[PDB]
Every structure is written in structure tokens, then in C-alpha cells.
């Protein structure tokens, strides 16, 4: 028993972290086989930030201008190119610690672990969700760019996020490993704001199932609801609409607990309309929306990674 | 910016995890140099649980009775001994991935990361505190015993916890790496309950400093208090007494923010007496007590590990 925000083990990723310095800027890079991937802003000076011309700045750099270090060892760069907002630096040595991996673009509402790094060295690991507004609620400082987000499926690391930038109110934005931003953001120091966020309904439902599995059952009521009526309430409380695909994905937890998804929707509706009256669920006074149905199943069943 | 419950990177620990099977029971072990450390209950059958005689059960096992596997490789056991509640299995191969390490006994109020494992394979990593009642609020299932808790200081892993057992209400108990339990608990399936827990005051104060550093300042009031008057209030709300040692440890955060510790005590006193009136601090509706002053400094300054 017990339920905690859990991150994936970070060792496979730690093995791939390096530091990249160009001129005076140092940030993190991801070394897979013989290529180091990093944010393209490593080539910028403090000056260049308001409106950088990356293509232009990259023309005047050669391979030797990039100082890549893996631990205490310099990796010689033998090629470079830019793909969207990331740079790919070909090095003369393949990383012997490269895990089996994929580059994936995740969808909003999905979760991943972030290995926060500074100067190519790991600082910590935590679990995040891609918010509906394409930001993440992270913990990043100057020098954290190039830190990555990932998921693990058995022995395979799916890299889904590279950190680039911090938006007003302390939320974070970045790209996929092909350098394409999540959301309508650009890597320049200009006026940018995230859209209004929304609550990830299917994840809240998943977490209520987690509460039931742990014996925290007080919020279960005696009613049911249609999907449409539930969504009318969810809308009012800035919750995203629950789709039939979401209902289907909740199937394993619904079958395990014997609580129909629409019955648990009726219970959530009551929590939204009435509040929790000073009670907690799994120790939380607010409804939690950064556990997916798969996260819940994975944690409550002890899924491991090779 | 941003503040998240962050765990230490787990790679050094992942490198040390193995599976131990004796008879029909399988749990996790920690392989350091040529010794595998695991919970002594691996030698018990389902039967033996109410009142095992461990010394007796261990007499009738020889080295070959323990099947240790590191990934897909069996490690031959060449010696065994029991130290308190843990077994030490000498193997014929030293673990090449052994990190620099120490065994430490932590104090209540201190935090650590847990690498939750099943069958010698990691499932997830999360951050915990040793509660004042000597339990931890974890997430563990059948087969998780032998999972360890740890801290990292540069390149050195300080192992402080081995998981043994789950207490009523889904809280967890275990030992240090010398096999001595934290708290008044024993490794037998008998009626056991944790004492009443208390809130870790110095950690709540640390987290309020974290909020200030992040710009969440609404709870700062205009007052001060003596240490004694503060402790009279803390007592009433089941908060542990704040000691001068705790005040001193908050010194770096107090100096960074310019808020005297006793001034922030006055603000905490008001939160305890008045509540938060539906407001949040760092996104939380409850006061958080599982960040130490060092955790806050470490996270807000980007401390990395070698
Ligand atoms: C990467 N190391 C930093 C990480 C930031 C620093 C503070 N917390 C972070 O996550 N990334 C940057 O400094 C990027 C980078 C220029 C500016 N920048 C920002 O994150 C800025 N934000 C924006 O401009 C905004 F709001 F539009 F996202 C800053 C005001 C410094 C937080 C480039 C090239 C985008
Ligand atoms: C180790 N793999 C399991 C981990 C437990 C299982 C459920 N969640 C956990 O953390 N450890 C055990 O099964 C230990 C072990 C006998 C029983 N036991 C317990 O944890 C039991 N708890 C107690 O007896 C109590 F309450 F006194 F702590 C159980 C009721 C199964 C949760 C031994 C040898 C202590």
C-alpha cells in the first residue's frame, strides 16, 4: 500500500548526459550513439537573446567551437547540424552506455520523468505531466536547459522532452527530441504567455481509483451519471471533457475495483460541486491530475524496468 | 523557478540491486563489493511469519540455498551471516558497479530517496522523510522488501534505509543497513502500531522559505515571536518543538531571503491559528513537512552529484 508521485529510475538517462559549451554558454546535452543533442541556444550570447538568428549564428561556428564533455572527458565534435530548435553534434565516439531508445512526441495529459541537470551532471529526478496548455510544472534554474524528460517501457527509454525555457508564473516549456516545441512557444526572450490551463479529468479519475485501491473510499456516492451530464459539470469547473477513449483507458482500473467509470464520474461531480469539506484523499486536500491510468496501474501492480 | 518533490538520481543504486531467493521467497538485495545485503525474512516461509526464529531458520540453510541473481546472472554465494535483521551474503564476485558509499543511520525529520524494486529490478524512485514516529510514508507492495533508501553527497551514496514491512494505515518500517530497525518495530507478523506522528516544524519553515524564493509571499505577516511562544502554539497543533539547532540550520535560507527565522515563525503561527482560507502555497493546500532546509537549498541552487 501507499501512493506516491513516482519517477522512473534515472540510470539509463544519467548515462547519456553531457555538458556542451559554446563560447561562454554551458548547458546540457544528450549523447546517444555518436550524436549529442542539445538546445540550439547554446550558441547564443546574453546579447543574442531577444531576437536571435540561429541559422546565422550557427554558420559562424565550426565543429571545434563546441566543447563537449562527458564527465571528465572531452568528446571531439566532427559534425554539426540544426533540426528545428535543437542541435545535433556528431562526435567521434559512440556512447557505450547508450540504452535502447526512441524519440516520441507525447500528448497533453501524459506524464514523464525529468532528470534535472546542471553542467552535464544530474541534480534530481521528478515526475511531471504535459499540461493541456503545453507547459510543464517543473523545477528548473539557469543552466538546466538540455535536461530531458522520458518514459521507460521495459528496457526502452522513450525520450519525449528537452527543456528550453521558463514562462511567467514559473511554468516550463520545451521541445521534443526533434526540436519541435510543445505549444505555441519560440526560443527567444520575448513576451510569451501560456494559454489558460485545464485539469486533466481522466487523470483525476485514475487517481480516485488509486484512492479506492488504497482504502480511501469516503467520497464514493450512490449515484451514476451520463457522460454528457458529467461533461457539463466538468466544463464549469475548468476540467477537460471526458472522451469515450478516456473511458476505455480507465477500463482496467474500473474492472479491478468493480466501480463503473460513470459511477466514479458521479462521485467526482459531487466533489466538484460540494468540495471536500476539509477532508483529504490519499493525503491530498486538492484533486490530483498528474497520474495517468497507466501510472496508477504501474505503481499499484509493481511494474519494473529492465 | 518552480519547486517539486525531487528525488536523487538513482543510477548508482540501480547498479547495486539484485534478487535473492531462498526456497520460495524472493526479495531484493543490495550488492556492494562482494557482499549482498537483504532482509532476513527471505528465509521465511508464509508459515514462519507470526513468530519466526530467525537464528534457527538460518542454521539450516547453507550457502547454496540462496539463489542470488544480478540481472541475468547468478552470483555464487560463498558465505552468509546475520547482523540484526539483515543477512549478509558473501559472493564470489565483487560488484564492478559499486559506488563510493557509506551506511548511515538517519534521524527523524531527515529525508531520503527510495528506489522501489521488485525481483531485483527497479520500479520507481521517490522522496520520503523519516517521520518522527519512525515510519515512512512510502509506496510498497509484496516483494518490495530489500528496496533501499539513500542520499547522495557528490559521488558518495549514503544508504540509510532497507525496507521490511508495512504498518496499519499504509505506512512503512525498516532498518538501517546494519539491520537495526528505525522505531520500536520487529520483523514479525504481529500486532504492531506506529506511535502518534508529529509534523516536522523545521521542514515546514524550510518550505515556507522555498515559497518566498519562488515569489509565493502572501502569508508573510508583519510580526515576530519568541521561540518559546512559538513552541507553545506548535505544541497545540501537533508540531514538534523548534530547537535552537533547527534555528541555526535555517540560517542559510534566512540570510538568503532576509527573513529572520523568528519572523517566519510568526507567519507560521498565523497559518496554524487561522488556516489558509482556501489559498495555496507552492500549489499545496496543506503545509508540507518533507523538505529539509538542505533539500530546499539544494533544489533552489542546482546542486549536482558526480
Ligand atoms: C536554460 N538553461 C534556461 C532555463 C530557464 C532559466 C530560468 N528557469 C529556466 O527554465 N533557459 C532560458 O534562459 C531561456 C532561453 C532565452 C530565455 N529563456 C527563458 O527561459 C526566459 N523566458 C522567456 O523568454 C519566456 F517567458 F518567453 F519563456 C526567462 C525570462 C530567462 C525565464 C531562450 C533562448 C528562450
Ligand atoms: C516485503 N516484501 C513485504 C512488504 C510489505 C507487503 C505489503 N506492503 C509492504 O511493504 N513485507 C512483509 O510482508 C512483512 C514481513 C512479515 C509481514 N510483513 C508485513 O509487512 C505485515 N505487517 C506487519 O506485520 C506489521 F503491521 F506488524 F508491520 C503485513 C500485514 C503483511 C503488511 C515480516 C517478516 C514482518
XYZ file of C-alpha atoms and ligand atoms in Angstrom:
682
model
C 0.000 0.000 0.000
C 0.669 3.728 -0.225
C 0.649 6.038 -3.233
C 3.403 8.471 -4.112
C 4.316 10.603 -7.070
C 6.935 8.271 -8.517
C 9.542 8.869 -11.140
C 11.160 6.322 -13.374
C 14.625 5.134 -12.384
C 17.077 7.510 -13.978
C 20.179 5.488 -14.515
C 19.795 4.853 -18.202
C 19.394 8.578 -18.775
C 22.196 9.626 -16.423
C 24.485 7.594 -18.648
C 23.692 9.876 -21.546
C 24.158 13.281 -20.026
C 26.954 15.530 -21.109
C 27.861 19.173 -20.951
C 28.037 21.390 -24.000
C 29.820 24.716 -24.065
C 29.965 27.083 -26.965
C 31.778 30.260 -26.274
C 30.697 31.227 -22.827
C 27.400 29.363 -22.561
C 27.205 25.895 -20.970
C 24.179 23.680 -20.953
C 23.311 20.038 -21.055
C 23.332 17.581 -23.900
C 22.059 14.065 -24.526
C 24.597 11.642 -26.007
C 23.084 8.723 -27.897
C 25.377 6.576 -30.074
C 27.623 9.128 -31.752
C 25.397 12.178 -31.574
C 24.906 14.810 -28.866
C 21.557 16.588 -28.882
C 21.220 19.994 -27.178
C 19.241 23.192 -27.258
C 20.271 25.472 -30.048
C 20.541 28.413 -27.743
C 23.883 27.186 -26.537
C 25.258 29.240 -29.411
C 23.788 32.455 -28.107
C 25.364 35.103 -26.051
C 23.415 37.076 -23.408
C 23.052 39.755 -26.087
C 21.546 37.437 -28.709
C 18.535 36.528 -26.600
C 15.784 38.963 -27.585
C 15.786 38.020 -31.167
C 18.433 35.516 -32.188
C 19.020 34.419 -35.765
C 20.039 30.886 -35.085
C 20.836 29.931 -38.648
C 23.105 32.866 -38.883
C 24.792 32.256 -35.560
C 25.374 28.624 -36.489
C 27.018 29.487 -39.812
C 29.912 31.079 -37.996
C 30.638 28.175 -35.722
C 32.693 25.225 -36.678
C 32.941 21.790 -35.045
C 35.817 22.820 -32.797
C 33.825 25.671 -31.304
C 31.687 23.168 -29.367
C 33.335 21.762 -26.261
C 31.534 18.602 -25.243
C 32.422 16.894 -22.012
C 31.291 13.562 -20.763
C 32.278 13.511 -17.166
C 35.950 14.308 -17.175
C 36.496 13.580 -20.836
C 36.241 15.791 -23.868
C 34.418 14.347 -26.829
C 35.632 15.582 -30.151
C 32.980 17.041 -32.348
C 33.232 16.043 -36.008
C 29.969 17.384 -37.418
C 27.037 19.631 -36.567
C 23.578 20.425 -37.821
C 20.381 22.109 -36.637
C 16.991 20.431 -36.654
C 14.286 22.855 -35.557
C 15.276 24.070 -32.096
C 17.960 21.504 -31.323
C 21.482 20.968 -32.447
C 22.906 17.660 -33.281
C 26.625 17.325 -32.720
C 28.256 14.309 -34.242
C 31.119 13.133 -32.103
C 33.921 10.670 -32.809
C 32.970 8.326 -30.047
C 29.732 6.424 -29.629
C 28.365 6.409 -26.104
C 28.907 2.909 -24.706
C 26.110 3.485 -22.264
C 23.502 4.200 -24.892
C 20.292 2.476 -23.972
C 17.654 1.120 -26.262
C 15.646 4.212 -27.099
C 13.069 6.095 -29.049
C 12.155 9.698 -29.609
C 8.435 10.251 -29.074
C 6.129 13.218 -29.059
C 3.757 12.908 -26.150
C 0.272 14.204 -25.897
C -1.134 16.573 -23.351
C -2.230 14.792 -20.255
C 0.579 12.304 -20.429
C 3.259 12.084 -17.761
C 7.004 11.698 -17.790
C 10.072 11.910 -15.571
C 12.536 14.801 -15.795
C 16.200 14.326 -14.951
C 17.184 17.856 -13.921
C 20.849 18.500 -14.758
C 23.405 21.294 -14.483
C 26.757 21.224 -16.268
C 26.048 17.746 -17.551
C 25.546 16.372 -14.037
C 22.243 15.201 -12.601
C 20.665 17.102 -9.768
C 17.388 15.301 -9.270
C 14.545 13.409 -10.786
C 10.842 14.181 -10.623
C 7.581 13.290 -12.340
C 5.646 15.829 -14.470
C 2.648 15.982 -16.796
C 2.425 17.695 -20.152
C -0.298 20.179 -19.273
C -3.199 20.822 -21.658
C -1.635 24.242 -22.309
C 1.610 22.627 -23.415
C 3.646 23.602 -20.429
C 5.011 21.570 -17.565
C 5.192 22.367 -13.905
C 8.860 21.779 -13.306
C 11.769 22.942 -11.207
C 14.477 24.421 -13.352
C 17.105 27.105 -12.987
C 19.695 28.841 -15.169
C 21.775 26.134 -16.810
C 19.109 23.420 -16.722
C 18.361 23.620 -20.456
C 19.081 20.359 -22.223
C 17.676 18.385 -19.319
C 15.351 15.732 -20.711
C 12.015 14.114 -19.971
C 11.402 10.446 -20.611
C 9.398 7.335 -20.002
C 10.700 3.745 -19.754
C 8.952 0.679 -21.125
C 10.906 -2.431 -20.056
C 14.387 -1.682 -21.295
C 13.498 1.069 -23.736
C 13.842 4.780 -22.922
C 11.324 6.953 -24.780
C 12.690 10.495 -24.750
C 9.821 12.976 -25.065
C 11.051 16.360 -23.784
C 14.094 18.643 -23.862
C 13.966 21.670 -21.591
C 14.369 25.136 -23.149
C 12.734 27.927 -21.213
C 10.615 29.265 -18.355
C 7.281 31.088 -18.833
C 5.596 33.545 -16.450
C 4.359 32.064 -13.151
C 7.168 29.506 -13.029
C 5.995 27.023 -15.655
C 8.227 25.480 -18.260
C 8.415 24.914 -21.990
C 10.490 22.797 -24.305
C 10.603 20.600 -27.260
C 10.526 17.045 -28.369
C 13.824 15.415 -29.377
C 13.330 16.581 -32.964
C 13.427 20.165 -31.692
C 9.735 20.974 -32.213
C 8.233 22.931 -29.340
C 5.291 21.700 -27.370
C 2.800 24.545 -27.624
C 2.896 27.901 -29.393
C 6.259 28.924 -27.984
C 9.550 30.077 -29.510
C 13.089 30.055 -28.116
C 13.583 33.773 -27.833
C 13.368 36.131 -24.889
C 10.161 37.834 -25.947
C 6.738 38.358 -24.394
C 5.206 34.891 -24.198
C 2.423 33.524 -22.037
C 0.883 30.088 -21.736
C -2.785 29.734 -22.532
C -5.236 29.058 -19.751
C -4.590 25.581 -18.378
C -7.259 22.963 -17.689
C -7.487 19.997 -15.305
C -6.787 16.550 -16.761
C -10.095 14.791 -15.972
C -9.077 11.243 -16.904
C -6.056 11.511 -14.591
C -8.195 12.742 -11.685
C -10.447 9.722 -12.206
C -7.401 7.420 -12.312
C -6.193 8.872 -9.016
C -9.627 8.377 -7.423
C -9.316 4.716 -8.433
C -5.884 4.704 -6.772
C -7.527 6.036 -3.626
C -10.117 3.244 -3.684
C -7.408 0.594 -4.128
C -5.674 2.088 -1.055
C -8.864 2.067 1.024
C -9.614 5.820 0.902
C -13.258 5.381 -0.113
C -15.210 8.121 1.694
C -16.047 10.097 -1.473
C -17.847 7.230 -3.258
C -21.507 8.129 -3.568
C -24.542 6.054 -4.500
C -25.163 7.590 -7.891
C -24.400 7.409 -11.554
C -24.371 9.931 -14.391
C -24.360 10.064 -18.177
C -21.137 11.053 -19.904
C -22.823 14.195 -21.293
C -24.135 15.430 -17.918
C -20.764 14.790 -16.329
C -19.073 16.817 -19.053
C -21.475 19.718 -18.492
C -20.223 19.868 -14.886
C -16.556 19.329 -15.775
C -16.765 22.232 -18.164
C -17.885 24.601 -15.460
C -15.010 23.692 -13.216
C -12.344 24.018 -15.949
C -11.937 20.296 -16.349
C -11.258 18.867 -19.815
C -14.031 16.848 -21.452
C -14.014 13.141 -20.776
C -13.987 11.198 -24.056
C -15.025 7.624 -24.726
C -11.336 6.895 -25.372
C -10.638 8.110 -21.829
C -13.449 5.909 -20.508
C -11.911 2.910 -22.311
C -8.438 3.628 -20.934
C -9.907 3.607 -17.413
C -11.212 0.092 -18.083
C -8.520 -1.856 -16.190
C -8.946 0.206 -13.010
C -12.731 0.057 -13.291
C -12.588 -3.723 -13.659
C -10.152 -4.087 -10.763
C -12.321 -2.091 -8.359
C -15.726 -3.008 -9.732
C -16.619 0.699 -9.962
C -18.054 1.656 -13.334
C -16.351 4.689 -14.852
C -19.627 6.637 -14.990
C -20.249 5.838 -11.324
C -16.887 7.270 -10.421
C -17.764 10.274 -12.600
C -20.838 10.758 -10.403
C -18.565 10.787 -7.336
C -16.167 13.293 -8.950
C -19.120 15.505 -9.903
C -20.142 15.628 -6.242
C -16.590 16.557 -5.188
C -16.543 19.378 -7.743
C -19.936 20.758 -6.720
C -19.515 20.352 -2.940
C -15.766 20.425 -2.260
C -14.071 18.078 0.163
C -15.117 19.878 3.382
C -11.644 19.715 4.893
C -11.119 16.036 4.062
C -8.167 14.587 2.172
C -7.844 11.883 -0.466
C -4.543 9.966 -0.438
C -3.298 12.690 1.888
C -4.125 15.487 -0.579
C -6.574 18.328 0.049
C -6.771 19.058 -3.707
C -7.696 16.696 -6.512
C -4.551 15.409 -8.251
C -4.338 15.246 -12.047
C -0.720 14.178 -12.778
C -1.172 10.384 -12.548
C -2.321 8.677 -15.752
C -4.363 5.463 -15.639
C -1.167 3.642 -16.633
C 0.833 5.328 -13.839
C -1.753 4.105 -11.339
C -1.731 0.571 -12.643
C 2.054 0.574 -12.810
C 2.511 1.725 -9.229
C -0.208 -0.381 -7.675
C 0.992 -3.540 -9.517
C 4.778 -3.165 -9.158
C 5.796 -2.944 -12.832
C 9.587 -2.963 -13.137
C 12.031 -1.934 -15.843
C 14.906 -3.967 -17.261
C 11.883 28.676 -10.680
C 9.405 26.036 -9.547
C 9.549 23.651 -6.601
C 8.942 19.927 -6.800
C 9.412 16.963 -4.536
C 12.678 15.757 -6.044
C 14.489 12.502 -5.639
C 18.164 11.865 -6.063
C 19.263 10.309 -9.345
C 19.071 6.574 -8.885
C 21.655 5.177 -11.203
C 24.330 4.434 -8.666
C 21.815 2.462 -6.629
C 20.241 0.675 -9.597
C 23.688 -0.741 -10.253
C 23.600 -2.494 -6.912
C 20.228 -4.152 -6.973
C 19.895 -7.881 -7.127
C 17.298 -10.509 -6.437
C 17.585 -13.004 -3.620
C 15.574 -16.193 -3.441
C 15.649 -18.692 -0.651
C 13.286 -21.537 -1.065
C 10.161 -19.976 -2.401
C 10.595 -16.391 -1.230
C 12.143 -13.736 -3.500
C 13.060 -10.252 -2.457
C 15.630 -7.633 -3.210
C 19.236 -7.358 -2.186
C 21.942 -4.703 -2.279
C 25.276 -5.812 -3.747
C 28.266 -3.781 -2.598
C 31.769 -5.121 -3.332
C 31.450 -8.830 -2.620
C 28.532 -8.787 -0.217
C 24.768 -8.861 -0.788
C 22.651 -7.351 1.972
C 18.972 -8.342 2.285
C 16.165 -8.662 4.768
C 16.448 -11.732 6.898
C 12.886 -12.693 6.246
C 13.850 -14.056 2.878
C 14.437 -17.289 4.768
C 10.877 -17.479 5.988
C 8.001 -19.346 4.585
C 4.420 -17.993 4.719
C 4.003 -20.203 7.789
C 7.002 -18.783 9.662
C 5.647 -15.248 9.745
C 3.786 -14.910 13.045
C 6.718 -15.731 15.154
C 9.853 -16.705 13.272
C 13.037 -17.875 14.956
C 15.491 -16.431 12.532
C 18.611 -17.832 14.129
C 17.114 -21.230 13.976
C 15.904 -20.907 10.414
C 19.328 -19.684 9.331
C 21.147 -22.630 10.916
C 19.522 -24.985 8.462
C 20.445 -23.073 5.360
C 23.731 -23.335 3.635
C 25.334 -21.013 1.072
C 23.856 -22.884 -1.877
C 20.325 -22.414 -0.598
C 20.474 -18.714 -1.535
C 19.983 -18.004 -5.223
C 21.274 -14.537 -5.985
C 20.749 -13.048 -9.398
C 22.185 -9.899 -10.800
C 20.221 -9.260 -13.906
C 20.512 -12.440 -15.887
C 23.463 -13.815 -13.981
C 23.640 -15.980 -10.911
C 26.123 -14.932 -8.282
C 27.560 -17.762 -6.290
C 27.205 -17.412 -2.583
C 30.286 -18.419 -0.597
C 29.383 -17.255 2.905
C 26.477 -15.991 4.985
C 25.838 -14.321 8.297
C 23.081 -12.424 10.102
C 23.530 -8.977 11.595
C 20.394 -7.888 13.431
C 17.571 -8.002 10.890
C 19.645 -8.297 7.728
C 21.588 -11.047 6.109
C 24.912 -10.595 4.559
C 25.704 -12.972 1.733
C 29.289 -13.093 0.636
C 29.519 -13.778 -3.056
C 32.466 -14.771 -5.236
C 32.266 -11.735 -7.420
C 32.648 -8.116 -6.405
C 30.139 -5.770 -7.983
C 32.007 -3.719 -10.592
C 29.390 -1.039 -10.315
C 29.867 -0.473 -6.618
C 29.811 3.215 -5.898
C 31.616 5.073 -3.190
C 29.351 4.550 -0.207
C 28.544 4.702 3.442
C 25.989 3.186 5.744
C 24.353 5.854 7.898
C 21.580 5.941 10.433
C 19.433 8.968 9.792
C 17.476 10.945 12.272
C 13.789 11.638 12.283
C 12.928 14.597 10.170
C 15.563 13.811 7.611
C 14.708 12.933 4.026
C 15.911 10.344 1.571
C 15.106 8.771 -1.785
C 13.680 5.255 -2.081
C 14.387 3.102 -5.120
C 11.350 0.807 -5.119
C 12.268 -2.594 -6.583
C 10.627 -5.937 -7.317
C 12.591 -9.065 -8.202
C 15.812 -7.098 -8.181
C 14.529 -4.651 -10.798
C 13.719 -1.005 -10.169
C 10.161 0.182 -10.423
C 10.409 3.805 -9.400
C 12.082 6.401 -7.297
C 10.519 8.795 -4.816
C 11.470 11.075 -1.939
C 10.441 10.319 1.679
C 11.056 11.599 5.201
C 11.814 9.563 8.288
C 8.764 10.552 10.308
C 9.075 11.466 13.994
C 7.305 8.170 14.748
C 9.974 6.229 12.885
C 7.877 5.291 9.930
C 7.936 6.466 6.350
C 5.107 7.262 4.020
C 6.051 5.076 1.106
C 4.574 3.052 -1.713
C 5.455 -0.585 -1.370
C 3.857 -3.889 -2.251
C 4.541 -7.593 -1.713
C 8.076 -8.264 -2.892
C 9.407 -4.747 -2.309
C 11.402 -5.697 0.799
C 15.105 -5.095 0.346
C 14.433 -1.873 -1.516
C 16.719 0.804 -0.105
C 16.666 4.459 0.857
C 19.652 6.701 0.305
C 21.112 10.140 -0.030
C 23.945 11.243 -2.355
C 26.665 13.724 -1.472
C 28.785 14.384 -4.587
C 29.831 10.912 -5.620
C 29.087 9.144 -2.359
C 25.897 7.145 -1.744
C 24.831 7.127 1.913
C 22.499 4.165 2.369
C 20.159 4.816 5.298
C 17.135 2.512 4.919
C 16.209 -1.045 3.933
C 12.510 -1.770 3.584
C 10.992 -4.566 5.702
C 7.317 -4.163 6.432
C 4.034 -2.252 6.286
C 2.174 -0.952 9.372
C -1.544 -0.160 9.701
C -2.789 2.813 7.649
C -0.285 2.177 4.859
C 2.919 3.439 6.466
C 6.224 1.652 6.291
C 9.012 0.428 8.527
C 12.527 -0.817 8.035
C 16.030 -0.794 9.174
C 19.352 0.809 8.654
C 21.983 -1.127 6.685
C 23.228 -2.744 9.895
C 19.788 -4.317 10.302
C 18.626 -2.207 13.260
C 15.020 -1.093 12.951
C 14.007 2.517 12.967
C 11.449 2.708 15.756
C 10.071 0.123 18.169
C 9.237 -2.420 15.490
C 10.115 -6.081 14.923
C 10.111 -8.185 11.755
C 7.282 -10.498 12.643
C 3.641 -10.538 11.635
C 2.262 -9.482 14.995
C 0.086 -6.640 16.253
C 2.182 -3.511 15.775
C 1.189 0.126 15.509
C 3.194 3.283 14.975
C 3.076 5.914 17.672
C 1.262 9.154 17.032
C 3.153 11.105 14.385
C 4.037 14.797 14.592
C 4.710 17.495 11.985
C 8.352 18.330 11.261
C 8.381 22.062 12.118
C 11.849 22.912 10.798
C 10.933 21.378 7.428
C 7.695 23.381 7.222
C 9.732 26.531 7.852
C 12.243 25.490 5.167
C 9.398 25.023 2.693
C 7.954 28.451 3.549
C 11.386 29.862 2.680
C 11.182 27.931 -0.602
C 7.839 29.598 -1.245
C 9.336 33.049 -0.638
C 12.236 32.325 -3.010
C 9.625 31.358 -5.643
C 7.583 34.525 -5.095
C 4.682 32.968 -3.140
C 4.769 35.546 -0.339
C 1.135 36.165 0.659
C 1.432 34.513 4.096
C 4.249 36.769 5.371
C 2.896 38.885 8.198
C 4.296 41.943 9.951
C 5.113 40.290 13.244
C 7.709 38.451 15.220
C 7.603 35.975 18.096
C 9.862 34.476 20.742
C 10.970 30.883 20.294
C 9.090 29.886 23.474
C 5.755 31.446 22.432
C 6.050 29.881 19.002
C 6.639 26.482 20.581
C 3.553 26.882 22.777
C 1.497 27.216 19.574
C 3.330 24.447 17.702
C 2.602 22.106 20.561
C -1.114 22.646 20.285
C -1.144 21.845 16.613
C 0.951 18.655 16.956
C 4.072 20.256 15.584
C 7.456 19.241 17.010
C 9.316 21.810 19.105
C 11.662 24.095 17.243
C 15.158 23.920 18.755
C 17.990 26.415 18.524
C 19.818 23.826 16.399
C 16.875 23.961 13.983
C 17.020 27.765 14.001
C 20.745 27.599 13.161
C 20.185 25.130 10.322
C 17.659 27.554 8.807
C 20.382 30.215 8.765
C 21.302 29.992 5.059
C 17.683 30.361 3.909
C 17.063 33.160 6.402
C 20.144 35.001 5.151
C 19.196 34.470 1.508
C 15.694 35.884 1.952
C 16.416 38.415 4.671
C 13.583 36.949 6.773
C 14.624 36.229 10.342
C 13.716 32.718 11.461
C 11.566 34.033 14.324
C 9.731 36.309 11.891
C 8.907 33.351 9.714
C 7.813 31.532 12.882
C 5.350 34.378 13.465
C 3.965 33.816 9.953
C 3.675 30.041 10.508
C 1.911 30.666 13.829
C -0.702 32.730 11.993
C -1.200 29.963 9.406
C -1.702 27.416 12.190
C -4.179 29.566 14.113
C -6.128 30.891 11.100
C -5.708 28.311 8.327
C -5.060 29.249 4.729
C -8.656 30.240 3.840
C -8.643 28.307 0.579
C -5.258 29.635 -0.553
C -2.295 27.527 -1.633
C 1.439 27.791 -1.032
C 3.640 26.399 -3.823
C 0.460 24.838 -5.177
C -0.287 22.989 -1.920
C -3.382 23.481 0.235
C -1.636 21.819 3.214
C 1.649 22.763 4.834
C 4.443 20.478 3.591
C 6.978 18.989 6.008
C 9.095 16.608 3.859
C 11.671 19.125 2.563
C 14.661 19.723 4.841
C 16.498 23.062 4.832
C 19.239 21.313 2.845
C 16.723 19.937 0.311
C 15.459 23.475 -0.257
C 18.910 24.920 -0.696
C 19.917 22.035 -2.936
C 16.941 22.399 -5.252
C 16.893 26.169 -5.416
C 20.681 26.329 -6.078
C 21.084 23.434 -8.540
C 23.449 21.179 -6.565
C 24.561 18.249 -8.721
C 26.063 14.848 -7.997
C 29.148 13.296 -9.571
C 18.034 27.195 -19.717
N 19.118 26.954 -19.141
C 17.269 28.424 -19.268
C 16.320 27.801 -18.237
C 15.294 28.783 -17.616
C 16.168 29.905 -16.657
C 15.386 30.210 -15.673
N 14.458 28.943 -15.432
C 14.513 28.124 -16.812
O 13.940 27.111 -17.011
N 16.502 28.963 -20.386
C 16.473 30.391 -20.732
O 17.075 31.214 -20.108
C 15.574 30.796 -21.956
C 16.348 30.977 -23.348
C 16.157 32.514 -23.592
C 15.391 32.989 -22.283
N 14.992 31.933 -21.702
C 13.913 31.934 -20.708
O 13.618 30.891 -20.212
C 13.207 33.268 -20.396
N 11.812 33.022 -20.639
C 11.142 33.623 -21.792
O 11.699 34.347 -22.554
C 9.671 33.261 -21.981
F 8.947 33.766 -20.946
F 9.240 33.768 -23.173
F 9.589 31.891 -21.977
C 13.476 33.749 -18.953
C 12.738 35.103 -18.780
C 15.003 33.912 -18.753
C 12.922 32.747 -17.906
C 15.844 31.492 -24.724
C 16.818 31.428 -25.908
C 14.312 31.277 -24.880
C 8.200 -7.149 1.832
N 8.280 -7.609 0.671
C 6.821 -7.089 2.458
C 6.417 -5.652 2.107
C 5.053 -5.197 2.687
C 3.829 -6.108 1.903
C 2.802 -5.326 1.828
N 3.374 -3.845 1.765
C 4.857 -3.950 2.372
O 5.599 -3.039 2.487
N 6.931 -7.233 3.907
C 6.076 -8.129 4.697
O 5.218 -8.798 4.202
C 6.321 -8.140 6.250
C 7.237 -9.338 6.793
C 6.197 -10.135 7.655
C 4.845 -9.337 7.408
N 5.175 -8.239 6.862
C 4.297 -7.063 6.851
O 4.696 -6.082 6.303
C 2.940 -7.157 7.575
N 2.941 -6.072 8.518
C 3.050 -6.336 9.952
O 3.118 -7.436 10.400
C 3.086 -5.110 10.862
F 1.892 -4.462 10.790
F 3.347 -5.515 12.140
F 4.084 -4.292 10.398
C 1.748 -7.082 6.595
C 0.455 -7.214 7.442
C 1.867 -8.236 5.568
C 1.711 -5.725 5.845
C 7.588 -9.762 8.245
C 8.606 -10.895 8.429
C 7.479 -8.559 9.225
